[PDB]
Structure formats: structure tokens, C-alpha cells
Design a protein around this ligand. Sequence first.
Ligand SMILES: C/C=C(\C)CC/C=C(\C)CCC=C(C)C
Lengths: 986, 371
Amino acid sequence: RSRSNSGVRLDGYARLVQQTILCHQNPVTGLLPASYDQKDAWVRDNVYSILAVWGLGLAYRKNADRDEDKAKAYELEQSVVKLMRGLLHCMIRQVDKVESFKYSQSTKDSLHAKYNTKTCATVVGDDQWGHLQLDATSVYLLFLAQMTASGLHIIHSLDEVNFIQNLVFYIEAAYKTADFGIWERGDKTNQGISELNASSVGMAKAALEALDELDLFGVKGGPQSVIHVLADEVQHCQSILNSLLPRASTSKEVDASLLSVVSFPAFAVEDSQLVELTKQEIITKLQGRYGCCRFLRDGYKTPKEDPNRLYYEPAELKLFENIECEWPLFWTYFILDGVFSGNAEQVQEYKEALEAVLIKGKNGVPLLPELYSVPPDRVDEEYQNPHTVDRVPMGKLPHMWGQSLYILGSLMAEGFLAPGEIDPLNRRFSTVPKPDVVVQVSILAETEEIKTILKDKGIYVETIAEVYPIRVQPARILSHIYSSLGCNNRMKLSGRPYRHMGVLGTSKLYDIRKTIFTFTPQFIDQQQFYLALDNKMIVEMLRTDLSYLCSRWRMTGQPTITFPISHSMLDEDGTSLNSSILAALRKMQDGYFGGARVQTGKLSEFLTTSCCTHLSFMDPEVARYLDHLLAEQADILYMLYTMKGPDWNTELYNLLTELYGKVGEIRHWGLIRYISGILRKKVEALDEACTDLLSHQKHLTVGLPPEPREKTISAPLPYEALTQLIDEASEGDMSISILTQEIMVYLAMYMRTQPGLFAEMFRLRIGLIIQVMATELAHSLRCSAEEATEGLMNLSPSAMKNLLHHILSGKEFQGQWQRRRRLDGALNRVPVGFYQKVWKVLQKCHGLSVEGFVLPSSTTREMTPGEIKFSVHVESVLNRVPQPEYRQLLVEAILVLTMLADIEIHSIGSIIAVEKIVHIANDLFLQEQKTLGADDTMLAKDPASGICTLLYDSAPSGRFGTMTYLSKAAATYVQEFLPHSICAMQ
Amino acid sequence: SAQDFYENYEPKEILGRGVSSVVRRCIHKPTSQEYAVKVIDVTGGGSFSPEEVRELREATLKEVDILRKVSGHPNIIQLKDTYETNTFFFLVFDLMKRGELFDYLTEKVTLSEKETRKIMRALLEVICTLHKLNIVHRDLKPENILLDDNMNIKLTDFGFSCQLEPGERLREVCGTPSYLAPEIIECSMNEDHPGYGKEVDMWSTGVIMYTLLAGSPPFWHRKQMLMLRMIMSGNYQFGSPEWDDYSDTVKDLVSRFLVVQPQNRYTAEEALAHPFFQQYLVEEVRHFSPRGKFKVIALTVLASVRIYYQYRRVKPVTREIVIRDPYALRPLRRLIDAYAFRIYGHWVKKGQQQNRAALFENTPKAVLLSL
Ligand SMILES: C/C=C(\C)CC/C=C(\C)CCC=C(C)C
């Protein structure tokens, strides 16, 4: 008869939400201003700030049996619809930016982070603010999918369905797009430098999964209202999340916003060890007694920053250490994580901790402070003793973002809401183990005459024609097809951009206009590049591509890879299958290949046990093609074909792809590469290839050693610009341009499968990689560098990949160690933590000088030991020596100071010339061998360095090793600079 | 069949690699227990001809046999079950979270006397079991030795093993060059020598002693045949400054396995009886003549006095001794070796051109370039 006590207590929560959040909702737009001082509505904050209203509305709807508690449930539900619709109008008024960002992932074409709360218009310009925040649109897209799944009808028209579909392509490239992120400041420096933040990558993955086959019209919807998401981009975000975490970016060791990725609302991390490790990293490095710092060296409202300058100078970062403002917002995330994980202890430690920071206001309602700031006088005390001084609440009061999750956490912790109701798409189960899937493979024959060669080897296949009505197509065709998904001419939306399709996309069965479609996997495409013309590379790519499939399939049915055997995959004779592919095919019949369970069969058998995705946008360019589809010496010719002029690409005739045809059949790699350079054939996955290397805390440098011509990649570059940078860094030589990108695939190939070869290289310098690969193939089969240069063009992709792995793994086919020091200092290979060891030494010194270029101790305070920017500073000083072998002598010379530094209690207190320590070590290496019987002939000087050639060839350790002489000369230099020394601890 | 493989185990991650065999970690679904699976490609990517395809199977079929002949023993892995397909041969065994002894010997260049004692105590006690069952290994390299989280030795890759018929001595050359006993090469260079028996394993084990305690093989040089003459002739040296800090009980036991003549070699049963592997059992009466008591009390004094004297002798690290001779004294030499293997620990691998001795230069350049 009376209202349930749940309804009564929700009234207190209704008052809390109304008095704190819903009283600021704009009457016209439904948007929420950040505060009275900041009268604008942020896309990310508004979505987060509406969660309390959405949770309250769901909580009130649980007992909707009376008129009033139906109505307040309706108000809260439709207030959420008002905000999410109001935020839709803000973004839908910038469809030109969404369309432009899909193709060019630039900051200048990004959806604005803040809008007019009164008119849904852009308050600020495209350059007056840090606008590219892919975790703000994704927080909208994720919850839009979740709120529709909960029953909230937000999307009203099929044009908005197209807009949201086009918004998927907007957030698809989050794994390869740098953005300012959750804190609108980009990197840690706050200098307008966009970076690949795990929050943006994680948020897009969850939003993409949330929108995956989601009907925006609810249950009363159709295929026209379904948002189609490609798992290639979803799992590409995973490859970045796994590589980035527990770090938030290359510049941030950790961010408390990763709590928005590991647990709520993203659930974007599938490995529970990563979730716990990242959450505990936040615990140690960020949490104190007033919340959690956003990220180390934040200084957003620290009293040691001027509130007038929008940017921070590099030296100011060290001023923020240990006195950073602390935000209780992240403690609401830990409460929310505990409710989802089911850790009542966690929901208690962070609830009492948050209840002691909540500032009471108005009629006793709790207000969540935006941040707790150190008083200006007490900054020095927290410098010395961390996280103990009393902080004052500053910033926004209330923080409408954090306040909502506090109420949302309060609602779900007192039994007014369940994790499933706030997460109807079941993202909370992302951490549960997933068994590996059985990859179905249907080997096909392009012609009948290939079916007989396979039959003679005992391979049961159907021909390309026997599979009809099921018809196979290249992976490109599938990419063209999705270019019609989300097309709206009046809204000027052009659908999905052309993106390369991996196996996760091409292993599905496609239902286009009632005709079942299977698409050949992209790594067999031969028109794009020459990686499909090496049959030993088909197996290697196939081996990893099945391994990628089995461990990363998240769709109904089993993946189906249709593998067509082509004439190129046969032998040079033409009557026998190539042994590498021959082994690969029988490998699949036995049921195991590349770590994946392969159930070989015919494409007809796998019709019912595959992911049959209906491509409803094709249901009544590419459609026209599909409509008909449904119904003397060779080497000389290039000298001719390049002296036609620069490639005119027109008909000045009297089509090198035809000339590229025979060389693919004869498989002469030097010639075929040259055609790819002069035709500018370019791989379709270099931008994930670069990003994967980039996401593992590496800087990619492509180009020959000199700095102005060698360009560094530190931020994820889009496909066009990254390729343009490679071509411009190709200084016109087309052979290096392809080898640059060709090695880039192999570097990413080994990085994904064997991460341990790059643990000693923090900067991937592709440009010298061709050089260092040239020297070993020059010393092997001893020949000139030019012959090696012609030789390097000539190896097969598998041989090229093996030889690069021969370089990286440390396997050996002047002198032995001279070849192990020209291969150790030319790749800038340094031991693990050496950049973390220079920091310790420089604190005991004034600097480290190499060839009279100093690396001062001021750098130690300026960047952290683990900062990759510091790694650049130590690295930049170490390339002041041109010759590679001498650099490694400097490298281990640096460490003999490190090991002597630990023994020595006192500090040198002056400059140390790392170069000189080698020189007298060269001089002292000279004297001992003279005394023991060395002739002047054996001790011959290196012409440029000044080191004996035998010293280069000398082993590291031993009585007469290089680091015994350098552990010897690292003491006479300390004699003059340090008159008195004390060595302890042995 | 492969179905039988996946009905009981699920391979998660790649643990190691080989020439044609891949080691992969798996989860046993019925037991949820960690287990290692070695995945040998029988066809070997098509490089293997039908003879090698057949021979690898027969080598693998034999390989199950020895690992089926020895079971339940603490320090060799248990082949839990073996699955054979037309293209692979799966072998599931125990999971060793840590890698081979080679990887460990790379991390710690010189392996301490206490640690090596239990290491080989197992290995010699491993060797006893093989010889008592009359099975020789011929392959006792540290990469063949696997260690677990408690450092326990798990001898692995009995791929070259073969059971001698009672009183029969082999002739085939099986094994990477450094760890080959002198008569292995001699039988390779002559037909009169009628073969080698189970005493082969003794030499290979004694080689680990020089490698573990010094970080280098007893005989190593960059060309192939030159190493061989150091082996058959048997010229080894506990060189200075490296090998002088170890106790004298170490040296004699090293020579015992390293004697070039097989019959005088130190077989496994008496190998564990050398003073190094003697253990202090608390409950021993240990009765002694009055002269025996007088020694003990004198030796108990002689010990205490000794320990004070030895310690007093250790020279603290000073500036000058670093200038004159770093390697000469232990604490700085072990350090130089340690930071030697942190920079170029990737340069040590399996084979002859990648052994650990390449990282040590113990001889003048002139003598090295004498010939
Ligand atoms: C115990 C060291 C004895 C000779 C070598 C001299 C040591 C040093 C000269 C200074 C180098 C590093 C310092 C880190 C603080």
C-alpha cells in the first residue's frame, strides 16, 4: 500500500542528484555545465555526470507500480535521454569534422570537447582548445549502446543511426591515433603534443564492443538500425592495451584514468593479471590520503604553476613532484570496481576514505571535491615527506563527473542497482577466460589443374568454381564493401574509410544480397606488395595469422579461413607444390598449425558453423561491381622503364604490373622490389605495424643515420602522413623506401611474437637496420658494400626476415668481437636498465661528456630515470661518436663507472669524459701487450677512433678483457678529479 | 590424434624454440596443472626428406622409450604421455618456469660453490640412475639441463641417448663439440678403438663443473678442430686469477672427471663419495682414538684460528689495486664478469661460435696470435 523503503531511500538519493546534478541541466539542451566558472558542457563530463541520473532512473524503475515513482523514473530516464540526445546534437552539428576525421585522423578535424550548454554550439574554435579526445566520444558511444540496451530510446532517426555508425569509424583508429585524452593536455609535458593514451584506446575498444551488432532502436528495431563493428579494430585496440599497460602512455608510467579502462566503465582489459597489476600500480604511485593523483608530475592546480599560462615549460615538471593535486574522483572508480569485481572489502576501504574527503554543503548533502591541493606554504614539507601534509579542497565543487559515480557507487553498494543493470552489455565479464577457438580452413584451388597437384599429394580441396554458390573474393573487396556502411548523402557521410582487413574480418562468412561471401585473407594479396610472392612467407604469415585468430576470436561460430592455392604457390617447374606450402597444407589436416586447432574441410561444410554476418547495407561503385559479380632481358627493361622518365602514370606509350608479373613468377627479389619502389607499392598495415612497435615504449626512426634526414616516430601517425614521412626520408632512393617499410612489418612481426629482442633497444632505427643488415651480409659471402647493396635487394622476404632476426636475436653466422661491437653499437643495443643506471651515476656527478658534448646532472631532476625522454638525452649524447664500435666501448665504459660508483662512497663532483676512459684504456691496453710480447703489427690503430683494432676484438671480461682495462682506466681519471677516494662494500 | 591432444591439454603460450621442436606451455583441463609440451615438426617445414622424416620419428619413438624407462625420479622430467601425428609429435612433460642452465649461467656468470653442489649432486645422482639402468646420454650440456623455481635440476633432451647392450660401446658421433669426451673424437678419427661406454657421461658432467664455477668451457677456441686436440690430449688449467679463490676440494674432483683415459675416470657412484658431496648427518657417533680426539680439538681450534686469519687477509677495495689489477681480486673480477654478461649476454647462445668463453680473454693477444 505504501512505498517500499527502497523508494523512500531513493528520495534522499533523488534529492542528492537533483540538488547536485539535475538542477544544472540546461532546460533547452539537457546539457550540464562543468561549474559556474566554467559554463560549458564537456562531452566526457556530461556522459559521466549523467550516470547517477541513469542509475537512479533504473533504481526507481525497479518498483514502478505507482504514478509518482513511475514519473520520477520517467524524469530521470528521459533526463538521461535529454543529455545524450543533447550531446548527440552537439556532435551532429559537427558532422563535417566526423567525416574529415575518419579519413585524416588529425586534431584539427576532431569533435569539440566542449560545447555551448545553452545552444549545443561550439563555444571555442578548432585550435583554441585541445579537442581530440577519443575517450570522450567513446564514453558517449559506450553508454549510448548501454543505455539503449537498458531500454532508453536515444537514437530517433536512421540518419542518426548513420551518424553513430560514422562515429564508430571516428573512434575506430584510436589504437593508431594520438589524442589529448581524458585530461585534455596530451603528453605529461602539457605542450600541445597528442599521445597514444591507453584511456582513449581502451575506451574505444569498449565502445566498439558495446556497439557491436547493437540495435539503436532497441528491441523494436531492424537491420537498418544496427551498428556494425569490425573486430579487427576492436582487437587492434587490445594489442595496444596489452603493450601499453600498466603504463597509460609512453610519457606516463601510470594514470588513474586507467581505472576507467581496466574496470569501469570500459572493462577493456581481458587479462586479469594486467587489471590487478595496473590497479596496484595506481595504488603505489598515485593514491595518498586525499584521493589519487591523475598522473605523476601532474601540476594541474598545484600552487607551483602559474594559472595564466596554458602550457608548461619543460623545467616546470620537476616542480610538481610529490605535491600534485589529488582527486577523489578516482576513489569512486575503486568503489565501482569493487562492486563489479565483488570485493566488499574494496567497497569499504574506498567508501570510508571517500567519506572523509567529501565536503558537506547546502543542506548537508555530500559534495565531491574535484581535487585536494597542497597549501603554498606546505609544499616543501610534502617534497621531503610524501603524502602526509593536510590538503585543502580546490577546483570544482562539486565535481559533477566524480559526484555521479559516487552516487552510482552508492546506489550499487546499497542494493539499489546491480552491475548488470548499469552494464546490460555484460562488459564486466571481459576478464573471464576465453577458450581458444578452432579455426576452420578450406584450402581451395584456383584452377582444376592445381586441384590435381594437391590431389596427387593427397589434399582434398574444392576448386574456386566448385564452391559456387559460395563465391570467394580478395580482402580488398570486403574493404570496399564497408565503404557503403553509414553513407548518408544529405548528412554528407561517406561511410567507412578504406582500411585493411585482417583475419578477424575476413574469417567471417558474409551474407550480401542472400549470397554467402567468403573473402581471402589479406596476406595472400599479391597486387599490393611482394610479401605474398614468397611462399615461405605465406606459411609464416599464415602461422601467426591462425595464432592471432585462435586467441582473439570473439564472434558466434568458428572462424573460416578460405585459403586459395595459386600458381605462384607452386614450384618453379610448375608441376609440384612448393615444399613450404606443401608442409603447411598437410599440417592443417592433422589439426594443428601455428598453435591453432585447424578443422580442415570444404567451404560448404562450414556454412552452418561460421559467423554469418548479414551485410544489410548492401540490401537495396562497389555495388555495381557486386551486381555483375552476383549475376630483351628483364633487368634491362627497368633501365628502359625508369628512363622513360619519372613514373608518369599516364599513357606515354609506343603497366609495369605486367612487367611485375613475370618477376613474380621468376621470383627475383632484387628486380621485384625495384618495381615496387618505382610503382610505389605500399603495405596496408604499416600504420598498425608502426603503432605496435610504438606501443611497446619504443621510438621508431626511419632513415639513414644523420639526424635531419632521419625522422623519429614517437606518436601514432596516420597512414598517409607516415608513408609520406618514409618516402621523404627515402631521399629519393626507392629501394630503401620499400626496405624501410618491409623491415617495419618484420620488426612488428617479431615484436608481437618475440618481444624479447627489443628489450635492449629503446629506439627502433630502421634506417641503419638496412645498413647493419648490409654489413653482416657483406662479411658473409665476402664482397663489396655495393654488391651487398645489390645483394640485400635480392634475398627472399623470409630470408630477409630471417637475416633481420639473425641480427636482432644475437645469432652469429675484421674480428669476432669487432663484428659483435659493430653490431652492438650500430643498433644502439644497451643492457636492460642502463638508461635507469645513468640516472644514478649522474646524481653523483656534474655531467657526462662524450666528445665534448655534456649530459649534465640537471637532466636527472628534469626527467625521471624511467622517462623515455631521458633515454633520448643519454642516447643523443652517445651518437656523438660516428663509428659504431667505439660507441659500445663508451656504453660499457659508462657501466664501469656505474659499478665503480657503487663501491665509491664519495662523489666525483665534476665532469667525466666517457670517451677518454677508453683512450687511456686503449693506451693501457697498449702497454700490457707490449710488455707481454705484442708486435706493432698486431696492435694496429683504428684510423678514425684511435683505438687499437685488437682492443675492439678483445673479449669483454677476463684478465686482459676490454672491461678490465676500462675498469682500469675508470680509476685514473677519478684520480685527478677526486684526489681522495674511499671504496667500500667491495 | 590431435583431438586426443586437445581433449586433455590446451597450449597457451610459446615457452621456447628449437631447430624443429617448439616448447609450449599448456593447461591440463582435467587437473588445471601446469605442464610443458614440446612440439616437434616432423615434416620440418618441408626441409626434411622422407629419410629424415622417418628418422626423426624413429628418434622420437626411441625418445619416448628412454623417458618411459626412467620415471618417478626426482631430477628428470616425466613424459606424462606422448601423442604422434602424421606431421607433428607432441610430448607433454612438467613445466619448468625457469629456463635452461645456460640461461641461468648467463645471468650469474660464476655459479657459487654451494649452489653447484646440489645442482650436480642431483646430476650425479641422475647419472647413477642412467648408468644403473645402463643408459648413456652422450648429451649432458647445460642447455639440456632445466631448472625449476626451487633451482632443482631437470635433465632434459635425452634425444641422443641410446641403451648399450650389456658390454657394448658406441661409435656414432652424437653431441655438440665442446662437451665431447676425448675418446668420442678418437673413435671418430680411428677404427681400432672399439667404442665408448657409459663412462662418457662422467666427462660431460665434469665439464659443467668448469663452466659453472668459472663461466667458460674447459676447452674452447673459435675454430672447430683446435678444440678437439685440447680435448683428446686433455690440456686444461685452473688458470689465474680466476680459479685460485675456490677451495682445493673443488680442483681434484674436476680432474677426476677430466682424465683423458676412460677406465681411470671417476664413476658416478664413487663420484658422490668425494669429499665435496659429503653431508653433515647430525646423528653420528663418530668414535675416535685418543689421537683422533686430540686432532678434533686441535682441528676445532685450527679452524677458528683459520677463519680469523683468512678474513684478516682479505684486502679491502682501494683505488690502487683497481688501477694495478682489477681481475686479480675476487669482488671486482666477479663484478666485471657480471656486467660483462649484462651487455653481451645476448651474444652467448648454443653452439661453438657462441660459447661463453668468447666473453673471456684470459691470454695475451700475442700468444693468441702466435700461430
Ligand atoms: C672504488 C672506485 C675506485 C677507483 C674507482 C674511482 C671511482 C670514481 C672515480 C667516480 C666515478 C663515479 C662516481 C659515480 C660518483
